[model samples]
Target: SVIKPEMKIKLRMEGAVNGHKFVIEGEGIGKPYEGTQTLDLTVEEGAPLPFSYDILTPAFNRAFTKYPEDIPDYFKQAFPEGYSWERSMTYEDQGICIATSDITMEGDCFFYEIRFDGTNFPPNGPVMQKKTLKWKSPTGKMYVEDGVLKGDVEMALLLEGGGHYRCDFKTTYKAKKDVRLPDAHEVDHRIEILSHDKDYNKVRLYEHAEARY
Candidate 1:
């Protein structure tokens, strides 16, 4: 069954434990997109949500979803060169939706960190959405480092107010393997994550880390 576009999924935030900073719980429909993707955003004061789907909607065709028989023929060849698709309008007015190169899921968590280059964004805008990065592993084993950041693109209000983010994120997931999945109660078993320590910071960008396990 195709999940409704307007489904309101619950993603709870559990503070911090050990080295893992924060945690997110609850399940939503499995993600339909992947690859290292980017999205254009219109920065509004408390008006724009981080998880807005429009940012990456253009590339939804490539996601692993079962499509109807009448799907567009171009859908099969929809993969954009340089791994990106540009969406013009971020909002009805006063916003620009830049296309992303790609977006890769960290692991099992629904949480995703959409990437961006410094171009086309308002200077000092929120380079990284504060509350968007959710979830942490129980053992603080999940972390990220070595990502990309473009100096040419400036975030509208990030660096202005003690928010000069020049590195990748260090994240964690909350669910355990035992009973995390809602439908599959059986132990689906051993999965892994990226680096547990050593997060990417402003000092260096365009980095990628390997799964510790």
Candidate 2:
């Protein structure tokens, strides 16, 4: 037997955060189990500190994507030609880089990465690569406080190409909660359809859409 029903799930974001406010709605004939149920979403601007889409790019990319096979697929279908970089502070004889990207097929997820040259560190010390320090998963919390976007996530690194190291990572960014919005832009808002997967005990990606504003 099958159960067909109609219902609505709502999520509200009404803080001082400067990120976008969005809604997700799902509907279909068979509902959760059936024929091509469609999910719809809408978003608007807010006044709080913005979500760290910059820091989330690589983290979500790594979490939603696997090694080798899925990596290419994730890049091609998710980011393709949409990743960008920014310069971070330079250390004594060492320079750091940050990459920000977005993945749209699985969901409206952002990614971020931090990189440094491997040759900068001493040979005997932990072997460092371009991704010496980066976020790899979503097992932490993200919030805004006092007009600052604060992010805390567990990070993992592969030293010398094999040694595994783990630690807690933290990042903060100043935000203009009352910043003005532009009439239009090259990139439009991102939307992703998420569904609760009981088997995985987490929210699974259902669909995604994005475009130029």
Candidate 3:
């Protein structure tokens, strides 16, 4: 069954749990799958929302999903040498990081990160800055340039903020692992800037914490 692209879905701010706003909850369909689509966006009360299927779907795909299928061969031609991709975009009060590079030897998998920084924004009223990271396990959907890996994470960040700031790359094993392994191991992570503990208000964090046998 085809999920109608015109199907109506809406996100309503329920309230705040800790400092994050409860957006909306309901189920939708995708790619002919039944009730396979869902969303839970909780950003800093006054900060901008962080999830968008439009921005996310492609970034996530570049970072984690199987590639070269729906991706045009012409697009693959854009990075034939397989250079890594990395870009950071910042604006008046927000920014995001997007980077990508080939992971699999066959170029089947790519390492990618899509991040947003709303911590710079002043809270709505009484909201405090609380950091949260949500992990989403690999549903198999999930960079380079320069002497650097050749690619365009900056494009996604640009899609978000239109600008950015740069920090030195602190090369380390954990950074490598955090970037490579989690998703490699099928673990997904989301960074959250909130006021309250998400769990306190029953806001779904979609935690991929180790499920017990």
Candidate 1 lDDT by residue in tens digits, 75-106: 12222211222222232213344323232233
In model 1, how large is the Cα lDDT of residue 31?
A: 30
RMSD of 1: 19.1
Clashes of each: 35, 12, 35
Per-residue accuracy of model 2 over 1-213 as CA lDDT, tens digit each = 111132122222221211234222222121222212232222233222122222222222221212133111212232322232222322232322232222222123222322211123332333222333222333444344653334444544444455544544444432212332222212111222244332212233331222122
Give the TM-score (vs. native) of candidate 2.
0.26
- Candidate 3, residues 22-48, lDDT tens digits: the string is 333322212111112222343324344
By summed lDDT, the worst window of 10 consecutive residues in model 2 runs over: 180-189
Best by lDDT: 2
Q: Which prediction has more favorable TM-score, 1 or 3?
A: 3
Highest TM-score against the true fold, candidate: 2
- lDDT at position 78, candidate 2: 21
